[PDB]
Amino acid sequence: QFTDSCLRCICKVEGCDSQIGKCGMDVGSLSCGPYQIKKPYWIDCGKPGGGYESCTKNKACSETCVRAYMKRYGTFCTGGRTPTCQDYARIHNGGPRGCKSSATVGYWNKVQKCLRGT
Ligand SMILES: [Cl-]
Ligand SMILES: [Cl-]
Numbered sequence: 001q002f003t004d005s006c007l008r009c010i011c012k013v014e015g016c017d018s019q020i021g022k023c024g025m026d027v028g029s030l031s032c033g034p035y036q037i038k039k040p041y042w043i044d045c046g047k048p049g050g051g052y053e054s055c056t057k058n059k060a061c062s063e064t065c066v067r068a069y070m071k072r073y074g075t076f077c078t079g080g081r082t083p084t085c086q087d088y089a090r091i092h093n094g095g096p097r098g099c100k101s102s103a104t105v106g107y108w109n110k111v112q113k114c115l116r117g118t
Contacts, residue, residue, distance in 0.1 A: 013107070015036060018034075019032075020058070033056040034062055035062045035063075037066070045068040
């Protein structure tokens with residue numbers, strides 16, 4: 001299962017409480033809030049909340065979205081194998097195929113340093 005420890009370390013790498021109420025475009029598309037959720041991710045997690053900006057600026061609604069996204073795409077990305085936090089963090093960063101993409105390994109390494117207290 002996608003755990004609170006996994007979620008917390010994804011939050012930390014994305015900016016977490018410092019991004020409550022905030023959106024930005026510096027990553028290359030619009031990303032909002034403590035988990036830096038983009039609009040297609042909010043569509044894919046089931047459009048929780050009052051709207052994209054309303055949900056993803058808010059920590060609790062963002063966590064509803066992330067949890068739904070991991071439940072929906074985790075075993076999709078792994079092809080049926082039980083997912084781990086490595087898979088969940090890599091699909092947060094890279095999309096539903098992210099757990100297989102070399103481009104998300106660096107992101108997992110940052111999450112894993114949080115899980116190790118580095
Ligand atoms: Cl793991
Ligand atoms: Cl790469």
